[PDB]
Amino acid sequence: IAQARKLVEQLKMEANIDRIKVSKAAADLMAYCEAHAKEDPLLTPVPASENPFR
């Protein structure tokens, strides 16, 4: 019963958490990828000049 009591308490003190909106979450996840897009040497391949691994 102690284990069940602790589990219920954990659910109780994690439920009362502020939520956000999925749409804006996905939009933010998109905006970050778009913003730091140019400095990603795997998405936009970098010329063989400053490619340390050649």
Partner 1 sequence: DQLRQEAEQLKNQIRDARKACADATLSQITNNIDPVGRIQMRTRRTLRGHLAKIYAMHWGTDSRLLVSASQDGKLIIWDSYTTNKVHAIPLRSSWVMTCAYAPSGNYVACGGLDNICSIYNLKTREGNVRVSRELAGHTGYLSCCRFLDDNQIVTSSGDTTCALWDIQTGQQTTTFTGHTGDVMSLSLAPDTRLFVSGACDASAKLWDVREGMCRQTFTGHESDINAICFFPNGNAFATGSDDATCRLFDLRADQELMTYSHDNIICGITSVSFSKSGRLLLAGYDDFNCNVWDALKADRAGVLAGHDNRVSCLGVTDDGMAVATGSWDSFLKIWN
Q: How far is the CB of 18 from partner 1 (least distance, A)?
A: 9
Per-residue binder mask for partner 1 (CB under 8 A), 27-46, x = binder: xxxx-xxx-xx-xxxxx-xx
**Shortest Å, Cβ 41 to partner 1:** 4
Angle at the Cα of 49 from the Cα atoms of 44 and 54, rounded to 5 degrees: 80
* Distances 50 to 11, 16, 37, 44, 53 between C-alpha atoms, Å: 51, 50, 17, 13, 9
Q: Which of residues 2-31 bind partner 1 (CB under 8 A)?
A: 4-5, 7-8, 10-15, 17, 19-23, 25-30
